[PDB]
Amino acid sequence: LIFILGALGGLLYGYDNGVISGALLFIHKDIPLNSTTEGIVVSSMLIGAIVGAGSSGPLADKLGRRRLVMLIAIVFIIGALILAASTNLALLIIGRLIIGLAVGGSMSTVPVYLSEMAPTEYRGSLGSLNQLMITIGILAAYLVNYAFADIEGWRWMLGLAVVPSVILLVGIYFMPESPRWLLENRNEEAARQVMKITYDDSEIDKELKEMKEINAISESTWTVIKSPWLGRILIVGCIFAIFQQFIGINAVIFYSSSIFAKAGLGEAASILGSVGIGTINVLVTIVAIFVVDKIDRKKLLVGGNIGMIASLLIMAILIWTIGIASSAWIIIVCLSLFIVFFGISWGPVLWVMLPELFPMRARGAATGISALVLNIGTLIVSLFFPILSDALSTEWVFLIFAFIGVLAMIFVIKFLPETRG
Amino acid sequence: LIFILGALGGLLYGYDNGVISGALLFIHKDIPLNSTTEGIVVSSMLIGAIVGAGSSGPLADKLGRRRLVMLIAIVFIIGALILAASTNLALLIIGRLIIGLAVGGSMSTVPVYLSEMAPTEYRGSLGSLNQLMITIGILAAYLVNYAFADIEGWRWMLGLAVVPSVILLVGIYFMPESPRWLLENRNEEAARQVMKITYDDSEIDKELKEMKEINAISESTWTVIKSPWLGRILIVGCIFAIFQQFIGINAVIFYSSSIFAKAGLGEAASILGSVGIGTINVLVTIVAIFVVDKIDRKKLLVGGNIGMIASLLIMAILIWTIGIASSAWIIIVCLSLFIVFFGISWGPVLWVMLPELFPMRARGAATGISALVLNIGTLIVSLFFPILSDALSTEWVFLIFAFIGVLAMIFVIKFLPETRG
């Protein structure tokens, strides 16, 4: 219920990166100039993600949850509709900026007001349902996207990023006061209140115990965090965020659409190609909950780095072999083979270990930095890499990242495997 | 038991390569110094194989076919009981040599002697039956090699190499004069009426016809052969024969009894590893009885060497991570793959495609010469490659052999057309 209506927001993360997948689909007749400053177009977008997400947690420390999350819904309608129009260097750089601050802000403030309204004991396989909600986000994203046939129409679909944002305006219009914000800030009244607003009186002395212990323990042991062994280990989870986001899907979907153009002369395969790619990825973000439990905590992510390195190997081969068309129908096949691997390990499973890895001591400042660095990753990707997809007639992409499947596989086996068997 | 003891000529043949398998398991206890001389020794095998294989045919046109197949089986008794003792490296050089000459005699002579004494209605897909019995010869070869628990006992089993060496001989013991040898060389009386004894005179009008017709148009077409454009197609049927052995198990077999024990740490995995893997070979060869016709030959050479390079790299990074207790376990494995993709594809399929390439009417000079260049490949792998095994701790064979299955991935859709149509 209430959960699926916030899931419309996780979904919003989905449609946002799926309509810039679609923005790297429909770009050229909106006059980008060029794939390089499209690199800087998406660079602008995820920069917004960074100063926005950097600015997320602490701006939340100043002003509280409710009107904040609302303010961000407002930023979403505002931004999406602002980029429902395109004029100059200004509104491209700028529009991308505001929408990005909105994205970073979004996925950063979901789980904390989710922690305040929903008990700490609820973050599980249903939160993973929030992740595959991001995924179906991709579904209707590119679906609607190609489903429109000319120029002002995907700007119009930024407006159709507004329609949900205004029901995501409405999505946060409805919440009573911010409960665990109250619980930490000594105003505990309205906390205890919404707490009885929904589930009736039984377990809340112990759930009060639980989340008050998460904010009071984070507030107790953030004392040793700024500097060493915690700090160093976290910059390993940062270099992890790096080796992880670097053979990585965000920008990968952007130029998935982009060479769904730069390969094949007419876009019907930007529909069976894009919506196929992602229907597969929903299928896969769904096998998520299966294989977090099912397979293991290592050989899966290894196998992911592997199958990546493979579909990138053959695919790059068909690429230089001058066979860019066979490398295209097979681009579907190869890079979607790759898609099935991104899905079977390194989206959810890696993460499930990641908070499972630290002591129960702290989360927010730390994991939020691994965040900043991770985004940092995405950004270098989107910036730089669409630029050498334009020129080389490129064999280089998938090889450089098979060796990134390799140095993040080096990451894999000297850092989070277990050697034997 | 005609084509059963003849195919026992096949099984002897492969059994020589497996012989060196249980060998590359027991090497260092025989007075070797060192793995390099192992290289020059299976080299010596395949050099005896080289002169023994070319001079099969012209010698067969000088002193006859019957005496020739017989003579070769005896080259088997000589080379094998010779190869059944040891003092210093000499009997290894000259032994693997004579043993070699007989083997070359097998591949070059025996299916054509089966071509004389049996109508031109057989040596095809049941010549592929001969293929089945040889992979049992190989499989059972190093199977028994590593069943015998000591060196003087597998020497006991090179005398036991003389055993099947003389049964094909027995297979040719009671045998009469060579029928199509008569049929082209003007002695044909016995040819016509042997064509009478074997298969009963109904189609042998059309078959005595088919082979005196092809004997005829061979008498007409061996002249426009040896120089350009036809020499261009033979040059590349020989590059066919080289990306047939630079990618293959004619190293990996014996030196996989080497890697299942000398990597695999105990030869336990030389029986389960090497023989077990050999039965995986047999599995995919039954798969070869059936998969001739339906999907493609070209694109499974494709997926084949594709997957060659799959396990080629996998092996490779599985090793640079230096996990070799567990990297060997996954190496019976990795192998099982390379052997399985080689199995779906280029052990049999390239070899049937050389008759499916060059004219119906002119075959022999070009396919036997393609075989000469073939063996050049095999022996290059023999000498050069296992000598590197005492050297670099290698990502490097199968990262190399990856690149081999690689330009073996590029030369396919760059050159090869498809043969079904």
From Swiss-Prot, chains A, B:
Classification via InterPro entries: MFS_dom (IPR020846), MFS_sugar_transport-like (IPR005828), MFS_trans_sf (IPR036259), Myo-inositol_Transporter (IPR050814), Sugar/inositol_transpt (IPR003663), Sugar_transporter_CS (IPR005829), XylE-like (IPR047984)
Protein name: Glucose transporter GlcP
Ranges facing Cytoplasmic side: 59-64, 117-123, 175-228, 290-297, 358-364
Regulation of its function: Inhibited by carbonyl cyanide m-chlorophenylhydrazone (CCCP) and by the human glucose transport inhibitors cytochalasin B, phloretin, and forskolin.
Residue numbers marked as site, Important for symport activity: D16, I99
Places the protein is found: Cell membrane
Keywords: Cell membrane, Membrane, Sugar transport, Symport, Transmembrane, Transmembrane helix, Transport
Effect after changing R96A: Loss of transport activity
Entry annotated with the keyword Transmembrane helix: yes
Record-level Gene Ontology MF annotations: symporter activity
Disulfide links within the chain: none
Consequence when changing Q131A: Loss of transport activity
Functional note: Transporter highly specific for glucose uptake.
Principal location: membrane
Residue ranges, Extracellular side: 26-32, 85-88, 147-148, 264-266, 319-323, 394-395
Species of origin: Staphylococcus epidermidis (strain ATCC 12228 / FDA PCI 1200)
